[PDB]
Ligand binder design. Sequence first.
Ligand SMILES: Nc1ncnc2c1ncn2[C@@H]1O[C@H](COP(=O)(O)OP(=O)(O)OP(=O)(O)O)[C@@H](O)[C@H]1O
Ligand SMILES: Nc1ncnc2c1ncn2[C@@H]1O[C@H](COP(=O)(O)OP(=O)(O)O)[C@@H](O)[C@H]1O
Ligand SMILES: Nc1ncnc2c1ncn2[C@@H]1O[C@H](COP(=O)(O)OP(=O)(O)O)[C@@H](O)[C@H]1O
Ligand SMILES: [Mg+2]
Ligand SMILES: [Mg+2]
Lengths: 52, 52, 382, 64, 353, 236
Amino acid sequence: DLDLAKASATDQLKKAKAEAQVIIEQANKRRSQILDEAKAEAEQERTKIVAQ
Amino acid sequence: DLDLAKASATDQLKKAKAEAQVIIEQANKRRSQILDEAKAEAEQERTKIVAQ
Amino acid sequence: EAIAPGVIERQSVDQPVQTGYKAVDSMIPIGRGQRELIIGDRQTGKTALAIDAIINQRDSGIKCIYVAIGQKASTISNVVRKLEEHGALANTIVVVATASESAALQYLAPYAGCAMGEYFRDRGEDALIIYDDLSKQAVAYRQISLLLRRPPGREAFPGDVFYLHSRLLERAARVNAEYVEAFTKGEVKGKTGSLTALPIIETQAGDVSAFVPTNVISITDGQIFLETNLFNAGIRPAVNPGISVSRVGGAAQTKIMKKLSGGIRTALAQYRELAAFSQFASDLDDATRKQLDHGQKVTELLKQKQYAPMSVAQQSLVLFAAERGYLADVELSKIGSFEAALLAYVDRDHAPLMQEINQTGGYNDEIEGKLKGILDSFKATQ
Amino acid sequence: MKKLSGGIRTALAQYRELAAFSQFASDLDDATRKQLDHGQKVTELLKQKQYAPMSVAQQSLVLF
Amino acid sequence: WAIHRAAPSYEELSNSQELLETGIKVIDLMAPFAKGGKVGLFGGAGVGKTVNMMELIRNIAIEHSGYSVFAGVGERTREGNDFYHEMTDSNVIDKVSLVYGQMNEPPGNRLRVALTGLTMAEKFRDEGRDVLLFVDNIYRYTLAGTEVSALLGRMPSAVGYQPTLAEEMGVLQERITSTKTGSITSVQAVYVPADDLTDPSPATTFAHLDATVVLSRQIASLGIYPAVDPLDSTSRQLDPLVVGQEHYDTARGVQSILQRYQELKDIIAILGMDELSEEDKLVVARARKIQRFLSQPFFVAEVFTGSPGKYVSLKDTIRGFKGIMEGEYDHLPEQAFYMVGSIEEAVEKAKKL
Amino acid sequence: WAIHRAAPSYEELSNSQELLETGIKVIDLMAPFAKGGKVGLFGGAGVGKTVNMMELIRNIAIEHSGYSVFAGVGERTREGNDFYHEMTDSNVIDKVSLVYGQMNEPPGNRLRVALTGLTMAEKFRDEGRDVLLFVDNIYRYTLAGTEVSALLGRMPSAVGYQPTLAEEMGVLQERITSTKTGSITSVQAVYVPADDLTDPSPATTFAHLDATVVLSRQIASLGIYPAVDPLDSTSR
Ligand SMILES: Nc1ncnc2c1ncn2[C@@H]1O[C@H](COP(=O)(O)OP(=O)(O)OP(=O)(O)O)[C@@H](O)[C@H]1O
Ligand SMILES: Nc1ncnc2c1ncn2[C@@H]1O[C@H](COP(=O)(O)OP(=O)(O)O)[C@@H](O)[C@H]1O
Ligand SMILES: Nc1ncnc2c1ncn2[C@@H]1O[C@H](COP(=O)(O)OP(=O)(O)O)[C@@H](O)[C@H]1O
Ligand SMILES: [Mg+2]
Ligand SMILES: [Mg+2]
């Protein structure tokens, strides 16, 4: 079971490299679509102001 | 080494949640800057068309 | 001065009037032909809620009317400027009797407004009318009455201060198709007119057991009570459940909302006794942990910004999330982020179901299944 | 009745003077605890059902 | 017939202990009423004295053979229309007679519309029948007198009321009574202005009713419906010789507990609940359980809450309250009792939390 | 000018919502003044109400280019005299117009004196300026109205107050607004009877106030001036 310890030590660090990958990929996408909504809103509030 | 792998793995997720919320917060800051600037500059268009 | 339609000319109220607000569209539903008091203390968001109700009818074929009685003239100009800002003014009549004007004009202002609302009612259309302060009308009438030496009663109001508001608000009605035919000499067939009212009352120090607030609670079909403690704590709109009610109830909602909301207001009346009694400690700590989690994240959920109305589709899945227990997994500070994310998620992925619920009342076991499939695909990808 | 009722006024008077402690009664001393628990019994004694009147002998016997 | 009549002679009156069951826990535990008696529902604005009257209509006036009369004095026309269609869409309309003087109408109509309903009911009474008479708000009959009084040149009285308040009220309330030839059973909603039960108009009415059910806002705002206050409701019929020793004794024990709980609220509010004797905490727990169990889901309030209505028989409610008082449900949580039917439904709801 | 006048018509009001920069950090931060607003001043005594009034009278003359009017409605004569001296030796007296109808005067004087100051501020407004109007106690304006109403024999209203209470207040408070040509701001000392914020007179005045600055004995005992309390001071 020396190498069971080696197996777990490989696996959990692989999994860290995976989860701490997707967390950041996902937050980057959230930031992308938030800065999309920002334009969708800013360019729509302009119409309100010119109609006013 | 099994134990310290257990620890240093979850280290990465602890880091990852912080670096997720940091970029989300920055996305929202850039959002508010986009909105406030587009509003402030469209107000000039309104005022000039009216005064004209 | 007129007498409202009689008992046989009315019809039951069956059509929803969407304000923008999660709180009132789900706990205190309003229907076309209803009368629904907005009552609270001063600087509580009464006018905010009323003109946000006007602004929202901008695009649903309801004509709106706003009567300002005894208000400051600058505030009235500011309200008109905001109605014009959001494009609503083209659809509203504004009747104004400022704080300076003779007491007779303030006394008679809301009857002049109902006379203009009843034009649309009797022609088979729908209208919405807002009496900005029916406390100031009562004060102006008390003045007119004491100057004529009439013996006053409780709180020095005249004897017939009930009849004053009674003969006014009883004109907000829904009339059936035969009344519209008879009135209009047969021009209009098969349409029912209506006139919805939202009188506003002001209470000193949170007293809903005064003379005039209770005279009007007794004439309308419900009340929205805005409490200043909730309002100062940032809970806005400060709808106090357990004092606010809707006397027509679910019958005035869409089917989806009628199913999702249910007993939520009595749920929060429970919760607001229980959280004041258990000010020290708790029992079934796990059970009351997941209760005063949701019985508290509801209150965190129903707060909403001003001038941001959200359609019935958007309110419906939100009440699903809250009511079915999905928010037991979230800390209070996250709720607003959670909703802000969900309402964009469903504008990206499930884009057409929103269009589908906006048109119809839309409830099916198909819809509940699809509305769980909406939660899950998002809950796993915030 | 004049002889016997004279003790009831005093029982209930001392009770009214001690009644404020009923809610902390656990901390009280056994000297005053006996007065506080006597007043309650002479109060429970004066309860009576409707249409059931008592001849003076019965009242005197019970107050005794 | 002329709507102005003299009340029946003292020689003609009749007295009837025949208890009348209503499937409402609080009303027929605390304040049971009899066939041929008068009931009044006292309450401020918006506390539930019309929903209660419609549930009594449901529980009595559909399960009753004789005719029935409904007078709407100075109330909403919306609700008169809703009632007219609820009747007509269940074919009970053709045994109910309606009169309406709703709040739109000028003072004369609201002033005299009660005597019209009474005249119809008195005609049905004299034919030898037995009748139900429901009056939708009898307070509007005197308010319409206060409005007119000063113009009739009469000096004002205590709180601006007409000087003839007690006579105006008595000369009406006196002709609505059962008699040897036939009986009128009635329910009257009695509005209380500014929630003030000592106002002259409510105060002079309590003397004219046999069962008084006093609703309150400080209970409705807990979500506990029907919002009846058991320390203020009362009935002439609550005697051991009329309802039996066990019903009477249960009712008195319930009042005793709730009163002892009222006495503790100030010390609980100042010093918190931990200073209570070890048996006063038990009184508080049973009092709160009793306050919950007094709640019930009505069939007419489905529109408000979704939950379906319940009907609870008297035999089935005194048993449940005797149980809660004797301590045999101390292991259930409070919420197990809120808005259920009999006690078995509480024992069940506890399983599901 | 005649002291009785109509309020600015609806189409004369200024089509914008500006702020007045007083230059006092506490006020400008915690309770900004709207240009053309009403402001309550709930301080007691000993805290320096009158030195705050002088500070505003000065700043609105020097930093902006307005004038000021001080209407003393039914208050001690002694205070008025020592205020007139505290101003003359701080050189602000050259920038303020004073009108005084103190407690000693008959009711008719104490009733109208508020309108005299107001109609002088309206003259300064017509000249295009920004004005600042101080009313030394609005509660005494209400009470003078009640006295005169009783003299005329009209029936008593809610707590003894005149029947015309809200109209008598609105016809004053409504003449002081911003306008397309100028504006009148107002700082009004308020007094609450029996400390009851529900009494009809406070309740009627509070409907018209925009900001509200509360002075505190404590903040002065700390030697910190101005003694404005940031937690009770409020502005809408
Ligand atoms: N949903 C909301 N979120 C945040 N702020 C709000 C909301 N609704 C109202 N407010 C704020 O509350 C303040 C007072 O609201 P509002 O003037 O509508 O109350 P009001 O009852 O009209 O006061 P008054 O009775 O004196 O007219 C406003 O400045 C507004 O910005
Ligand atoms: N059994 C009940 N369950 C739920 N809500 C109830 C119940 N009884 C009354 N209510 C509430 O009481 C409110 C007051 O209505 P109503 O009885 O018409 O008052 P009023 O007696 O003044 O007419 C209703 O809108 C309803 O929501
Ligand atoms: N801004 C300030 N700077 C220095 N001292 C001040 C200031 N404000 C108030 N004080 C002190 O407090 C006193 C307040 O007196 P005064 O202005 O007459 O108040 P009031 O008129 O309300 O009695 C001043 O005389 C001074 O001692
Ligand atoms: Mg308002
Ligand atoms: Mg009713």
